[PDB]
Design a protein around this ligand. Structure first.
Ligand SMILES: Cc1cc2c(cc1C)N(C[C@H](O)[C@H](O)[C@H](O)COP(=O)(O)OP(=O)(O)OC[C@H]1O[C@@H](n3cnc4c(N)ncnc43)[C@H](O)[C@@H]1O)c1[nH]c(=O)[nH]c(=O)c1N2
Ligand SMILES: Cc1cc2c(cc1C)N(C[C@H](O)[C@H](O)[C@H](O)COP(=O)(O)OP(=O)(O)OC[C@H]1O[C@@H](n3cnc4c(N)ncnc43)[C@H](O)[C@@H]1O)c1[nH]c(=O)[nH]c(=O)c1N2
Ligand SMILES: O=c1ccn([C@@H]2O[C@H](COP(=O)(O)OP(=O)(O)O[C@H]3O[C@H](CO)[C@@H](O)[C@H](O)[C@H]3O)[C@@H](O)[C@H]2O)c(=O)[nH]1
Ligand SMILES: O=c1ccn([C@@H]2O[C@H](COP(=O)(O)OP(=O)(O)O[C@H]3O[C@H](CO)[C@@H](O)[C@H](O)[C@H]3O)[C@@H](O)[C@H]2O)c(=O)[nH]1
Ligand code: NA
Ligand code: NA
Lengths: 386, 386
């Protein structure tokens, strides 16, 4: 055959499945991608004026405590020692972030020892018992009190979900969001970095194999019947939109989206930190990314006097807009459960597997997706190709 | 012979010289150490109540951009991903540190962009031209202005050197101490961590070799004539006090010292950061070290409800007191230059080499010492043992 496996999509999920099949089974794998680039939403490319790497589908920071995934992805790229950190902009002052002794000192006026700070939160959050809460506004206040809630959460949350906190489930926060030390790593995980020569280089390396064929700029639904004709019992992995596979026969799945406003400024340094959250409602966007800071080890290939930055906005996502975050209304999660039924049928009837962010209506971190792929590979695909 | 090389001292300098001679030349090396422990001032040991590693000769953070040294020391111990960070305590508020957009925001009331902040420092430091300064107080103010100087430098400096800034050379600061971003790594170097099983374990590994013999609790001047008798043209490396070698025949070298006040507290967490500087004169000590935080990856072998901390004080150092920092008065640096003459004579007449912190009256970082040793090894010792 020309191929033994067809993979729809070239996000981390497709790529992984693909590469395993190529290197571990030695099969011929054909990757079909709609866009003109490899990588799915993880893709990054250089801004033309400045040369600086940016991400046209949202900023991507790689982090995992999953050693399996880590050793794996390191097979295809090295990482930097980048540790992600964030600052929160509120009333013209940049606060340390997330919530901890640092922010606490800046906001309530003076230093609180760890023990002091636990107590400070005790009194503040005493208003509502977490067992009481009816919506998102309460449940937070019940965890950290009104002063903090109103300053750092209320508007930020509102902007991100286009809504009032009072009209959101209480179940969306599940943990005390406060640290009683000065540690402001944003992420708790074992391993963390950025791909050394960027994501594009990395993603691309995953498909650079003597058994993988990649057709960019190709829609699967336009070429499916043709390709399956060439070798009919070659199986498919579909990482595209779940609902669309089944021609929305059952209602459109509901997604949240993002609009990105990307400017080049005539300064070498606009905020001196990669990410700057904006928590006051006076501003449309949720945060400003300044991309040079993600790779400071490159700042000798960077513009002395220019910098690229990007403002992130949120809204609901519909048609033509890129889907980013599943919304998961109740009326979404059953039309899902339903499509599951369809997919399984379709998986047994016609050897077509469903995976990844779009393919399962589900938020996935990068390592999550990669693992999800590796699961499917080992559990479903090894026997499916014998 | 029983030994081919005698090494006085077991600090990093001795150890290095020793280990190279043992592993690269295969010589028999006898290490003579006055204290009862291996390691010199780098040594660390567990506080008995809590089990927590501490440093009885000052806190030690390892950091280098010298790859040679790095690959070397990794031969004897692994390091953690510890990045050192510091906070400055001034008027009951803990400031981000060192001086940068962060501290700046906290102190002058609101966020300053990088460009804004450069300008802010322009006006502040405009008072005195750096070309003018007569003492340490001016030279700082000429670099960062009075508001900052007085808040974060004046008292801290005074405590550390027991003096008024106005009576210190202008040459002790040589660089703008301000960052125009939010990056608060304390150290600029390529590599940085803490020894995984502590320094004691590490240091000790360097002497664990089938050609190295270690006699703890032995003063060299008490046993020298004896040992050199056993094999008279076996050479010595002396890493002890330079002046004392030559029986202070030429004036006592002047050192600064430290007194450490070490307490165990009945709390799991006293300040939630490894180091907390204290910049106001209301406090005797310069900073408080809280040692559990140096190894957070151990906090599941740490006391749930106790923590060891330590307050650091400075003064001048004399006899019986441990020497820490060369003072380098003018009347010190010529009595030095002189002892150099003596040493070289003594090096040619009697094959006795002088090295390391004490042996050269000179502040040395760990990697500096190690490199200094490696220099001496390759340049003077290889031919000296043929
Ligand atoms: C804003 C934002 C930011 C981040 C993240 C998500 C979001 C939304 N993620 C990273 C990322 O979005 C996610 O992990 C991956 O995109 C999932 O990879 P997939 O293969 O599952 O989907 P992905 O969407 O990447 O791949 C799908 C591919 O299929 C193609 N395709 C679709 N329909 C097709 C059709 N009909 N025919 C052919 N091709 C078709 C698409 O063109 C696309 O290339 C993340 N995770 C993390 O761990 N850390 C982070 O910091 C971030 N950052
Ligand atoms: C407070 C403080 C903090 C730090 C540092 C210094 C100070 C003062 N240094 C680390 C350290 O102090 C320095 O790098 C080493 O001690 C130098 O190693 P040496 O072998 O040169 O001397 P060192 O003093 O360690 O070794 C001398 C040894 O010789 C022995 N001795 C002396 N006289 C003798 C005699 N007559 N006979 C026999 N034995 C004798 C002593 O007992 C001792 O064991 C540092 N560096 C860095 O890179 N990062 C850091 O964070 C720090 N931290
Ligand atoms: O300043 C802040 C930050 C967060 N939040 C709340 O916490 C949530 C966290 O969202 P956000 O800070 O915007 O994004 P992350 O937590 O960094 O990441 C989200 O998106 C990432 C990439 O898209 C995924 O890796 C994460 O799982 C997902 O939580 C927000 O919706 C808010 O409800 C605030 O109120 N204020
Ligand atoms: O809060 C601060 C910190 C520093 N300084 C000034 O900067 C100097 C720096 O000294 P200090 O902060 O006490 O120590 P380090 O810079 O961390 O380290 C000193 O001691 C270390 C270990 O002993 C060595 O690695 C360094 O080379 C040596 O500069 C001080 O004397 C002051 O003059 C201030 O004014 N305020
Ligand atoms: Na409560
Ligand atoms: Na000036």
């Amino acid at each position: 055959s020309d191929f033994d496996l067809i993979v729809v999509g070239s996000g981390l999920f497709g790529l992984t499945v693909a590469e395993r099949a190529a290197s571990q089974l030695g099969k011929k794998v054909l990757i079909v991608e709609k866009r003109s680039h490899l990588g799915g939403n993880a893709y990054s490319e250089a801004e033309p004026e400045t040369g600086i790497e940016i991400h046209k589908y949202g900023a991507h920071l790689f982090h995992t405590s999953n050693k399996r995934v880590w050793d794996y992805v390191n097979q295809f790229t090295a990482f930097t020692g980048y540790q992600h950190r964030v600052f929160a902009m509120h009333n013209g002052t940049a606060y340390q972030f997330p919530m901890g002794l640092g922010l606490i000192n800046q906001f309530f006026g003076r230093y609180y020892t760890p023990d002091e700070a636990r107590e400070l939160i005790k009194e503040q959050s005493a208003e509502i018992d977490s067992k009481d809460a009816t919506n998102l506004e309460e449940k937070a206040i019940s965890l950290i009190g009104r002063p903090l809630y109103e300053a750092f959460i209320r508007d930020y949350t509102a902007k991100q979900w286009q809504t009032d906190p009072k009209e959101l489930p209480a179940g969306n926060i599940t943990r005390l969001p406060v640290r009683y030390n000065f540690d402001n790593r944003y992420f708790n995980d074992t391993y963390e970095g950025l791909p050394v020569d960027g994501y594009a280089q990395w993603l691309s390396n995953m498909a650079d194999h003597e058994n993988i064929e990649v057709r960019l700029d190709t829609d699967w639904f336009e070429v499916r019947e043709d390709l399956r004709a060439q070798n009919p019992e070659a199986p498919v992995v579909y990482t595209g939109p779940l609902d669309r596979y089944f021609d929305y026969s059952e209602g459109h799945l509901g997604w949240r989206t993002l609009d990105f406003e990307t400017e080049v400024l005539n300064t070498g340094d606009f905020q001196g930190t990669p990410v700057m959250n904006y928590n006051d409602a006076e501003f449309p966007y949720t945060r400003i990314h300044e991309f040079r800071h993600f790779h400071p080890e490159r700042e000798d290939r960077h513009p002395k006097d220019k910098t690229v930055i990007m403002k992130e906005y949120s809204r609901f996502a519909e048609e033509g807009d890129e889907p980013y975050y599943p919304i998961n209304t109740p009326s979404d999660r059953e039309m899902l459960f339903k499509y599951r039924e369809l997919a399984d049928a379709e998986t047994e009837s016609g050897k077509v597997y469903f995976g990844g962010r779009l393919g399962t209506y589900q938020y996935l971190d990068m390592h999550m997706a990669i693992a999800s792929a590796l699961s499917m590979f080992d559990n479903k695909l090894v026997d499916a190709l014998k």
